[PDB]
């Protein structure tokens, strides 16, 4: 019951190999009541040789999984609190790349682990107990960097609604300016902006691709000329999808100040034109200069409004 | 700045394909049939596997507006539910194939859905997803994909055929050497001449938009290239053939170019659509600047599904669902000007 749960056919040959051999002249040993301990020593080296062999497996097996739980505990800890307004944004570009750091180093642990099974097939036609291993190998990894980029993008998912157990602004986050330029409302933030990746400048979305390219760029196995960016693609969209609330919730936030700007319109100020034209449309009237002077009252009113 | 007519239509019904995609809309006649995708239910992980439920869901478009309403079905259906699935139909029997499920990557063997019946049936071959197929009415094709069930395989450049009246795959030995492990590729026919067409695909980290087209007659490959505005290196991209001037119609879907020893990651998306006529090999980018605005026009998105469908007196492309970015349930169609 030790080489079924990795379910390997290599370490059933093992199996088949192993066996207690006892002779028919060892049917003639025990009634001598001499010293006879030959035929247990001959299993017992044969069994020592598989218990070592079964030693190595194990930890073959407990190391493999062990790596993966770093990539998570890694990940989940450095994105719970971001708190990355464009300059600490910069400065976690830096601390990701820590992130990436631990990627890397159980890189390093990916060599030294394709060693140790190296040791742990302990076969000659290798590849094919390859196959059997690196197979399952491979989707478990996959498996560890959805679950991953999972929580990641959970953590900046749960910071939409101000309104379920508390409000949502609780830090300093991301600071947007509005200002009138060219006689109109213009967020250097814009929406847009801050939404989709255009010339000027790249934000959230383009943040989240870097994430995406700095959790998914592990060495795999099966000749090592690929990455497994593409088994995330596929999982995320397969059951978890935390994009898709990104989405929804983003163009959200985006409806919500599209909003806050007509409310912005809403000044009831003019178009910004010229003086001269309604002051001459004025003259046209020909009115005394106090309709004038009530003009600069409401004028004034404006400006106390503003 | 050529020709084009964006339009969003309208829905009607509780009933509708929301927040799907990697669904088919499949077209025989007047038998526009939605089939598989993905959503989600966020109530339990049982909920989560009926996502891409097995519902077939009908439509009864009217001058834009669309009335949804779910067929029923009888026979061997499949108790999960399913996307990447390839699908093709015999003339009165769908004929589905491959796809993955979300949980266990349990792909699923052949079935179809006899439509005048209303019912399933199990007829019965890597086990793959993401490949694409074909029917050449006596032959059902499949190529490329992946695989993965039991052995966790990669992409593949194999192909088969399915005989539908001796009920057994056989396998086209590949004359041309160049086709490479490829899924998530396009595969359709020209009516020139009776063949396949390749139009690149996904391997290994890096998309692909090579043209291979197979020779049935000659159970042989050629290799065409292209040029005139093409789409360098995209996938997932709505499709939709034109037999009368032999015209490929793309929009969109997952595009971006780097070298593999990058990370490359940064599959942006496109909402431009091109075509390619297949008798001058030219693609032509069917964008357009004489129209309203540029911002009624969908938005960039892969793994929606198409179709060619007539709205209002016209053939058009339709584009349902889908991955602008995540999750759609917008129906488009950009009407196909005159140019046919």
Known sequence: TCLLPVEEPLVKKKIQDMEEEVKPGIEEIRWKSTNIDQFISKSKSIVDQLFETVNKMKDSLQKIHKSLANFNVKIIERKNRPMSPDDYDQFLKAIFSNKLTIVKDNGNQIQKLVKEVLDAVKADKKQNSWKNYNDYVNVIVIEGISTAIQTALLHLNEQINPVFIKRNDISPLFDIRLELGQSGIQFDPEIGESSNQLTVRNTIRN???????????????????PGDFLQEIRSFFEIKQCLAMITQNLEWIENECNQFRARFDTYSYLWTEDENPLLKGCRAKIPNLDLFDEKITHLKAIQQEI | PQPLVWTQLKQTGTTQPTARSGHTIITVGKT??????????????????????????????????????????????PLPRCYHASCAISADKMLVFGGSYTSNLRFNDTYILKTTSYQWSKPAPQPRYGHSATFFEGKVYIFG????????????????????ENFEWTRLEPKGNPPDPRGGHSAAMMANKPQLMIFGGWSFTSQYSNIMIYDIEKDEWVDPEIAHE???????????????????????????????????????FVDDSFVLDIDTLSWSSINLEADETSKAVCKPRPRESASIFYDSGESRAIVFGGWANNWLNDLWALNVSTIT
């Open chain 1, 207 to 225: 943040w989240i691709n870097d994430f995406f390219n700095i959790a998914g760029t592990i060495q795999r196995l099966d000749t090592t000329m």
């Open chain 2, 32 to 77: 526009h049939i939605m089939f598989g995708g993905l959503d989600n239910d966020k109530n339990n992980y049982k909920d989560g596997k009926i996502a891409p439920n097995n519902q077939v869901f009908t439509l009864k478009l009217t001058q834009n507006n669309c009335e949804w309403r779910q067929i029923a079905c009888q026979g061997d259906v």
């Open chain 2, 145 to 164: 994909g992946h695989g993965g069930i039991n052995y966790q395989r990669l992409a593949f450049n194999d192909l088969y055929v399915l005989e539908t």
């Open chain 2, 230 to 268: 093409i789409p360098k290196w995209n996938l997932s991209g709505i499709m939709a053939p034109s037999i009368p001037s032999w015209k490929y119609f793309i929009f969109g879907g997952s595009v971006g170019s780097f070298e593999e020893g990058g990370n490359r990651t940064n599959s942006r």
